[PDB]
Design brief:
about 190 residues; mainly beta; 3 helices; about 35% strand; binds fe (ii) ion; zinc ion binding; EC 1.13.11.20; dioxygenase
Length: about 190
Amino acid sequence: EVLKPRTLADLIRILHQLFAGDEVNVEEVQAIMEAYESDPTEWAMYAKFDQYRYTRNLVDQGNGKFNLMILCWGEGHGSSIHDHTNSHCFLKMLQGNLKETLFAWPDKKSNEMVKKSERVLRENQCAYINDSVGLHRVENISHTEPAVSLHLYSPPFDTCHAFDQRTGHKNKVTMTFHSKFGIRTPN
Ligand SMILES: [Fe+2]
């Protein structure tokens, strides 16, 4: 049981099949992403780090059905609290560990945001989120080692909202790619 990709290339091929249609079986995609055993030799071309902030590195555009990308988290790097613009979002660890904090959605009223769950993603683990699940923040647990994660978003999206933990107020954020297909972007 569970089709096991032996390479990152196998995984991409399978994903093209699983997203070719109208339905997407979330638990099936998750298990297959989790079954791929992270191999740094295969994804090192995408692992382009920045001193001050995590980077987004596009791997594959999934024939318009999804975006597959690798996020590189320096020592102590973390994300804002954010949503996912009504898409599916899968997150798989490739190296290190991320702490995921799930938050409830704010009301129109201003106050402190509420944590709904907290966990550390294990080696090779694939997590899943969408807007109905909640909001989340993700961060490198380590101040001495990096983390690397593989993200799949379907449909693709290039804007989301970031939330202020103190008030729940949000701002629209346009995300950019640090590199695409192993090639640094103009910035
Ligand atoms: Fe996210």
